[PDB]
């Protein structure tokens, strides 16, 4: 039925809107029965999704695209199928397939949403994989590898080793200070400063990191800053270390005044 099945659909939409999902679903099926058009299936999938039956929704939709292809259905509507699969997978917390099905939807028909939803799901995946990468024992293994390359003056490999440590333990200030040490040896000073800064936000009480920052600042003739960094360094050294690296601070203080 032309106008006949469109009423069943419309009746579904009325029930769907009042959150009566099984009632919506049955009218969507009636619509399909009367007139083979995949819109009605996309709509049933919406009802299934809203019920929280995410597997049923994906099932309904996978079938919808297969039947839509056989029927040569409009590229937009099958793009919605793929898009809803993406949503359903995202509700299932399966980030791979949500991304895969967003790609599939954009391939069929590029829209603004879905492009935004893809970038958000990709963002969310990056964050997750990063949080999975974190490993205590792999971090300690990297810290040991770094010291080995550092003792053998292999700065480029030490940098890599210490980057693995930063990735394996993003909260350990030693990784940044250590990469900062190797970077300085390679005379990449602005980078050495930046790693020292992140080391100091990770551990405000980490003296060695203040000393590297200042040393690298002196090396790039940033004298005003070097003296400030050295003050901060001396304050935290009194508090934390009983001023046990004061002679080292002083030498750098003297060079930064000269």
């Amino acid at each position: 039925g032309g106008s006949m099945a469109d009423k069943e659909k419309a009746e579904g939409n009325k029930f769907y809107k009042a959150r009566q999902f099984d009632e919506a679903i049955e009218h969507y099926n009636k619509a399909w029965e009367l007139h083979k058009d995949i819109t009605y299936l996309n709509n049933r999938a919406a009802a299934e999704y809203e019920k929280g039956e995410y597997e049923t929704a994906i099932s309904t939709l996978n079938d919808a695209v297969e039947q839509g292809r056989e029927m040569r259905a409009d590229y937009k509507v099958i793009s919605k199928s793929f898009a809803r699969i993406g949503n359903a997978y995202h509700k299932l917390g399966d980030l791979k397939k949500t991304i895969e099905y967003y790609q599939k939807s954009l391939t069929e028909h590029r829209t603004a949403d879905i492009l935004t939803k893809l970038r958000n799901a990709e963002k969310e995946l990056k964050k997750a994989e990063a949080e999975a990468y974190v490993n205590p024992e792999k971090a300690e293994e990297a810290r040991l590898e770094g010291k080995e390359y550092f003792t053998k003056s292999d700065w480029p490999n030490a940098v890599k080793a210490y980057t693995e440590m930063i990735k394996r333990a993003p909260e350990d200030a030693r990784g940044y200070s250590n990469r900062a040490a190797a970077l300085a040896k390679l005379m990449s000073f602005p980078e050495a400063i930046a790693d020292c800064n992140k080391a100091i936000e990770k551990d405000p009480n980490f003296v060695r990191a203040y000393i590297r920052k200042a040393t690298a600042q002196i090396a790039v003739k940033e004298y005003a800053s070097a003296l400030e960094t050295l003050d901060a360094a001396r304050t935290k050294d009194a508090e934390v270390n009983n001023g046990s690296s004061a002679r080292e601070i002083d030498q750098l203080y003297y060079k930064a005044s000269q």
Partner: peptide
């Protein structure tokens, strides 16, 4: 809610 057509 998801869009119905």
């Amino acid at each position: 809610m998801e869009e119905v057509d």
